[PDB]
Ligand binder design. Structure first.
Ligand SMILES: N[C@@H](CCC(=O)N[C@@H](CS[C@H]1c2c(cc3ccc4cccc5ccc2c3c45)C(=O)C(=O)[C@@H]1O)C(=O)NCC(=O)O)C(=O)O
Ligand SMILES: N[C@@H](CCC(=O)N[C@@H](CS[C@H]1c2c(cc3ccc4cccc5ccc2c3c45)C(=O)C(=O)[C@@H]1O)C(=O)NCC(=O)O)C(=O)O
Lengths: 210, 209
């Protein structure tokens, strides 16, 4: 059996980025999918630390919280900076990614029809700090932090892809971002994952919006 | 002092890292930012995400309260004994951050009409951290392992502000209650929490708590 197990609802959501990590890194993993009926039965839920998914297992290490998983994988597979200073910068990117993700998730599930124009109007000002980060790291030719990939790249990558779905062309205002996205998705294993039914046949979110 | 904390004159998302610094005998400087200052827009335009806190470690400049916590935990050895404990630590902090966000939305966006439901949901919101204590040496040490981590300071602050928001919310949780007492009594932290620069600082900016 693979050492890793992803326990989630059948969507990309907060598991998209860590799945891309694992795929690009050539790791193997079991997917455990949870239906509404099963969630509604309440036994799994009660057993989750914060009563939510994703749930992740690495051997007998059981983790909750999507960014915990990302950092845990970034730690063990060496995608967490080359040094302590880089690691901080990697954290600083991911906190920003999370911040925007929280807003995205709020729009998608609590206020899509009403808030979408305001959201898209505000999108440029929200993406710009990431464009700025690229420009300050080797002309944005390599990765979000340093010259080696990190978990934040995989998280940022997902974030930009879902926003291109939400707001087609949004990256037209951000040359570095746009290319970044093309480049990281050209990575052979990731590209193969992204084109696969495993990724493509899952809806981004669970309410049918995007 | 090698550290600089740039922020608004409230505890808020700087309370945990202040406690961390004081408890670890670290020295730091406070650049307090006023409305006016914030209003000229030079600072803000300068901030990666247009927000505070901003932090300095020698020549390193950071943003994001949780990046600063992690940076301090990492460089001062407050991040678990190993990768496995370091994961546990993140799992506590991310959870602390989820409740805090809820706390923050209640306080600034929905205090009058959301407080009853907030406080009724509270115990189920605090049970995970009591359970976490329950699984680690019967809760007589720390939130993870037997050495303090950045998550302790962050969870400590979370529990203190809730005790102000809903006095006695810890009364049904004996490990949480003893833990708050234990950590709050650590000499350097104890002195800091009794000091004016803590006590005379408003928790939040809009006068609600
Ligand atoms: N800080 C944590 C947070 C993790 C987290 O949010 N988990 C949620 C995800 S469900 C997710 C969610 C919602 C609505 C729906 C609605 C329809 C739906 C159909 C098919 C699949 C999903 C999957 C997820 C999901 C939803 C669906 C929405 O309303 C929710 O807010 C969430 O965004 C959950 O487990 N909910 C179960 C419950 O609390 O009892 C982390 O980063 O890991
Ligand atoms: N993910 C980040 C989040 C950091 C963050 O939220 N920063 C905010 C803090 S201001 C804080 C805040 C708000 C309202 C007020 C209202 C009155 C007020 C009076 C005196 C002091 C403060 C201090 C903070 C503050 C406020 C006050 C509220 O509306 C805000 O949401 C915040 O909770 C900020 O810099 N605002 C400047 C602006 O963006 O332009 C992190 O973890 O560090």
């Amino acid at each position: 059996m693979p050492p890793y197990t992803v326990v989630y609802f059948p969507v990309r959501g907060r598991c998209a980025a860590l799945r891309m990590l694992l795929a690009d890194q050539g790791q193997s993993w079991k997917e455990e999918v949870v239906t509404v009926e099963t969630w509604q039965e309440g036994s799994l839920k009660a057993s989750c630390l914060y009563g939510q998914l994703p749930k992740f297992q690495d051997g007998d290490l059981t983790l909750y919280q999507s960014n915990t998983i990302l950092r845990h994988l970034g730690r063990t597979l060496g995608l967490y900076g080359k040094d302590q200073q880089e690691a901080a910068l990697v954290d600083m990117v991911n906190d920003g990614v999370e911040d925007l993700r929280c807003k995205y998730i709020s729009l998608i599930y609590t206020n899509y029809e009403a808030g979408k124009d305001d959201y898209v109007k505000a999108l440029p000002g929200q993406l710009k700090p990431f464009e700025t980060l690229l420009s300050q790291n080797q002309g944005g030719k390599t990765f979000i932090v340093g010259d080696q990939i990190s978990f934040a790249d995989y998280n940022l990558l997902d974030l930009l892809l879902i926003h291109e779905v939400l707001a087609p062309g949004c990256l037209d205002a951000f040359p570095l971002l746009s290319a970044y996205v093309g480049r990281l998705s050209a990575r052979p294993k990731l590209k193969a994952f992204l084109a696969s039914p495993e990724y493509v046949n899952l809806p981004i979110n669970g309410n049918g919006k995007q």
